[PDB]
């Protein structure tokens, strides 16, 4: 088929040429135009009709988030953000994801050759995804507080920051603990957790090694460690694992799902959400085999139907569900395994 038409917006002249070199070197994509700011990009989008836009967050003289707001409103298209591994970049990137950008990449040190080739392969991966991606609050009432043995595990990748936000926002304070692994670099996961916390009735935080796993709390995996459930005596604990990535994933959804299958078993509900790849598929099968009920986000609501698809294909998914029914289905399911207290 034809090459993917990419438009790159970046304030740095060197980056605009770097992106040109990277993207054009791949045979299934090409840079049809570059632009240093949102104004020049506007007319180039109309002239060259790109399929994918890469957008650097830090543009000095203007405001790129309002460009992204207007773009997603009047001409929505796949947008991949390019961010710096900084706190200011993390806040702007998450806000970009709220406005409708589907994914983002962090710039490594491109002065080192291996950082340039890793960035190159990552940029090509996001562009191929973005060309096919689908582009995208009542509090649930009368939820009883269940046993602290009850737990929900959630995994996500591309589109997962918005999917997770839609699932957590209506959760009442009596919701069981949630362990959440979202593919994300270190640092970003802290700002991610902090923004979700301000939007949620439950407490959302980045998971800390050794802390007890409490009802009404969601624990976000840190960007540089595997998040696992562990059992310290009688009580659930967070365990952060600095072991190696598994198929280039740390935190890994598979690792989380397996640890939950092991230490929670039938007292858990597993949820696999939008994202590319197969992370979570094999762990969800262990969860299923341990007696946990498992849900997978359906294709019509996924930005990328990759991770739920692979989980389904592995045979460990009980139920496919639209994103906007996930909150109710997972609460109802985990509640059904809870005997009366009264
Ligand atoms: Na090319
Ligand atoms: Na909160």
Numbering used by the authors: 1 to 136, 145 to 350
Sentences from the paper on this structure:
To address this issue, we crystallized CheB_Pec and solved its three-dimensional structure at a resolution of 2.3 Å. The enzyme is composed of an N-terminal REC domain and a C-terminal methylesterase domain that are connected by a linker of approximately 25 amino acids. The asymmetric unit contains five CheB_Pec chains that can be closely superimposed onto each other, resulting in Cα root mean square deviation (RMSD) values of 0.23 to 0.61 Å. In each CheB_Pec chain, there was a gap due to a lacking electron density that, depending on the chain, extended from amino acids 137 to 144–150. Lacking electron density is generally attributed to the corresponding protein segment being disordered. The gap was flanked by a segment with high B-factor values, indicative of significant protein flexibility in this region. However, microcalorimetric titrations conducted with all nine pentapeptides and at different analysis temperatures did not show any sign of binding. The answer to this question may be related to studies that have identified the pentapeptide-binding site at E. coli CheB. This binding site was found to comprise amino acids 130 to 140 (colored in red in Figure 7A,B) and is located on the C-terminal extension of the REC domain and N-terminal part of the linker. The inspection of the sequence alignment of CheB from E. coli and P. atrosepticum SCRI1043 revealed a high degree of sequence divergence in the pentapeptide-binding area. Importantly, a large part of the E. coli CheB pentapeptide-binding site overlaps with the gap observed in the CheB_Pec structure (shaded in grey in Figure 7B). We therefore hypothesize that the structural disorder of CheB_Pec in the region homologous to the pentapeptide-binding site in E. coli may be related to the failure to bind pentapeptides.
